Structure 1
Amino acid sequence: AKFVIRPATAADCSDILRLIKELAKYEYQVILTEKDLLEDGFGEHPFYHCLVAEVPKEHWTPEGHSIVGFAMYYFTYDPWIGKLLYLEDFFVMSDYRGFGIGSEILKNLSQVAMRCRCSSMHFLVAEWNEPSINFYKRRGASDLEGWRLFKIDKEYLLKMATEE
């Protein structure tokens, strides 16, 4: 009912994976491990940053968890405009929604963007996810040729890395 928003620490990684998997579940599997998450976020070069919502013992989940929400983000670069904050995952446990946790994470995300001089914050939302679409729209969000996403998988990267 009351809560604190703070940067994640390494000891939060198990809760982060649990919430990544709960958001995946809401959108739809997840093959990332706690160890990856730990190395990728808290090693020498962080590949993502996380804000976490923490509730007092009074309001811990039935399973005993203090962390009831999170956001995962990273920076991207638009070579026409400049740096962007990219919001990757954003989720509050179903029983703690509607009490301002979300809005507080978004204020903290907003602060990061201004500190870091991002012109905009970018994020994906599913078509069917109507409550989230309206929630974002209320806060200023607009929606954005025809350019296709391509990927080259590690087996082909390996081939090119190791040909001369």
Structure 2
Amino acid sequence: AMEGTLTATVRLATPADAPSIAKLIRELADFEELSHACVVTEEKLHSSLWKLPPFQGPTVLMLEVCQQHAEGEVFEPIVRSVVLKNPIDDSAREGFRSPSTGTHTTVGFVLFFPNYSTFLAKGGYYIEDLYVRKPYRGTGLGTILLKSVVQQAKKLRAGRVEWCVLDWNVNAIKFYEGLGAKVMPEWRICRLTGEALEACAL
């Protein structure tokens, strides 16, 4: 069991992280009660990610823990000390060994990509997924991961940082509101997919 103080690391994901990303996307879909809709594979991540420079297309940041630079680098890892709220019991620890450092455990991820506001006439960032494994929630790790994205977005002069939440996901809403984000009740998401997308033609 992990006790006392942890060292938390937020770093750019590499193709070697595809197995862990696939497992975390599946855990998130299971949390959102959307397992049937989730068809992610390591192969699909290799086909679609790591094609464009980081922050110029879909980009993943990995969150990892362990028991406690030159010019023009894209993303220097963010390293923070975290005093544990309670000791952590992680039965999944061995299946989440980090490919960057063997002594690190992968505990979360975030996927984000550029968006654009016409009212601001400025580019922003959109966060697609934000996920922390169950034994590591409530001790400040999700705050470090979200704030690392926001800090990068601000460095890139983002007008806004946006994302979506399920109306029933009260713990995430409280978490986002506590960081200054506003839940906008007036907007609804529209999706054109599957057969309806196939049928949509001129």
Whether the TM-score (by the shorter chain) exceeds 0.5 is yes
Could you state the TM-score of these two structures normalised by the residue count of structure 2?
A: 0.69
| Residue 62 (1) aligns with residue 91 (2) | yes
Closer, same or farther: CA 93–148 of 1 in aligned 2, 3 Å: closer
Partners of 1:147 and 1:105 lie apart in 2 by 26
Question: How far has the Cα of 1:156 moved from its partner?
Answer: 4.1
In structure 2, what is the equivalent of residue 23 of structure 1? 28
In structure 1, what is the equivalent of residue 14 of structure 2? 9
**1:51-88 CA-partner distances (Å, limit 9, x unpaired):** 11112389894331121101111111122222121011
Amino acid at match of 2:198: E
Number of residues of Structure 1 aligned to a counterpart in Structure 2? 159
In structure 2, what is the equivalent of residue 34 of structure 1? 42
Question: How far has the Cα of 1:97 moved from its partner?
Answer: 1.0
8 A contact 2:57–2:114 mirrored in 1: no
Closer, same or farther: CA 36–146 of 1 in aligned 2, 3 Å: closer
Q: Which runs of 5+ in 1 are unaligned?
A: none
Could you state the TM-score of these two structures normalised by the residue count of structure 1?
A: 0.84
8 A contact 2:89–2:135 mirrored in 1: no
In structure 1, what is the equivalent of residue 59 of structure 2? 49
Question: How far has the Cα of 1:47 moved from its partner?
Answer: 4.2
8 A contact 1:40–1:47 mirrored in 2: no
Identity across aligned pairs (percent)? 29
Q: Which one of the candidate residues 124, 137, 149 is aligned to 2:190?
A: 149
- Higher relative CO (CA 8 A, sep ≥ 6), structure 1 or 2? 2
In structure 1, what is the equivalent of residue 119 of structure 2? 80
Partners of 1:38 and 1:115 lie apart in 2 by 28
RMSD, aligned α-carbons? 2.6
Question: How far has the Cα of 1:105 moved from its partner?
Answer: 0.7
Partners of 2:163 and 2:173 lie apart in 1 by 11
Secondary structure in structure 2 of the residue aligned to 1:42: coil
Partners of 1:44 and 1:112 lie apart in 2 by 17
Partners of 2:187 and 2:137 lie apart in 1 by 36
8 A contact 2:18–2:42 mirrored in 1: yes
Secondary structure in structure 2 of the residue aligned to 1:3: strand
